[PDB]
Design a protein around this ligand. Structure first.
Ligand SMILES: [Cu+2]
Ligand SMILES: [Cu+2]
Ligand SMILES: [Cu+2]
Ligand SMILES: [Cu+2]
Lengths: 128, 128, 128, 128
């Protein structure tokens, strides 16, 4: 509640939120991702990935090419501020990151990088 | 155009887009597939195949079992909403299908069924 | 040199030889596999896998089902006499196996089990 | 028997002849190929392919690369004087060719172009 959000990615290619605001007074912020539904990771895998709005396209593009065994993320992608693993239905993953990595006024996007998902599974993140 | 999309599958085993939007005010939608590159068709052949997300795995698995002879598609597969032929380098093929075949509340995936290709060659199709 | 062979699998989905001879007077035989080219493992990965001709199809079918994370080989597959790891471009791997595992009168095939690859990446191994 | 020969290719990668002599008084010559054994075409396919000795390596190499659905022969290969289709166990095929295509004094080879078989399955053909 204070410094975390719980997010679900389902079999209908939806996150159950499209907007996050991180309280600047949190030292760290945590996203707890889960995957209701029944489809497997190779058909309906979801991650939660954070970048600047400007970097989203390249993160998604390079991620899609990286393949499932790399969680559809380019390894060591410096544009990725934080991310969960790619999960299938019934799996879960959390990611915690340092709030100092964000700056007020900058535009951030969160999204899933499974091929074709970012067009449907994305939202804004703000720091206040 | 308003009722079609151009898509490329290349010799890096990628499509050049992974998300398609079909405008519900179209009667029909056309996918124009092309194949930049130069590898033989029996090495890097591509098609564009559409099914629901729930059906994708079966279409791909049965498709590979069907062999090159059958363009890696199970003949008269009822799960396949639309598909192009399998093409090699420098070739083109288009498929047109009725938008009435889609519903606003369903999840669709497009993909190549050549063995192993769907690892990267897959994406979403959404009716809006 | 008398008890080993160097073999390459390339970006054209070919091995650079399709017939290997194993000298009966060798106690052990070594295959040194390399991968000229530049495609990544998840597009054009190769291994070198040995079975009887009669087991080849079953090994290839089950290997495909096993996934890239298993190097496209069924775990503990009793039909695989010997195998390298799966490698991408610029990588190499060797396997050594006891020549006593080969029997006179039997027919052997080597092949890559990456999806679709065995179509062209297959060959014979003969004990002399 | 004066203008034909029956040849078997078995599960042991052997033809049952290593040498053919075509009587030049024949207008045409026929090879009747059969495949004793149990193994199917995809792991133990055999064809009977005729070229000059000088052309054999290129025919075999390009044949390999062409795949099972092309009977492991390059389409319209001008170096191929005559060929059967590729057969598996229990199957049969015959080819007839004009004897005028052959020159007395020239060296010819017959062989199977299934990957790795030509090293084991080849012989000479002479016109007299
Ligand atoms: Cu997703
Ligand atoms: Cu493809
Ligand atoms: Cu391979
Ligand atoms: Cu053969």
């Amino acid at each position: 509640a204070e410094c975390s959000v719980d997010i679900q990615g389902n079999d209908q290619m939806q996150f159950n939120t499209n907007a996050i605001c991180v309280d600047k007074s949190c030292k760290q912020f945590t996203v707890n991702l889960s995957h209701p539904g029944n489809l497997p990771k190779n058909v309906m895998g979801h991650n939660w990935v954070l970048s600047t709005a400007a970097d989203m396209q390249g993160v998604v593009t390079d991620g899609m090419a990286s393949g499932l065994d790399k969680d559809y993320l380019k390894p060591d992608d410096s544009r990725v501020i934080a991310h969960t693993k790619l999960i299938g239905s019934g799996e879960k993953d959390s990611v915690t990151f340092d709030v100092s990595k964000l700056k007020e006024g900058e535009q951030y996007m969160f999204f899933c990088t499974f091929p074709g998902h970012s067009a449907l599974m994305k939202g804004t993140l703000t720091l206040k």
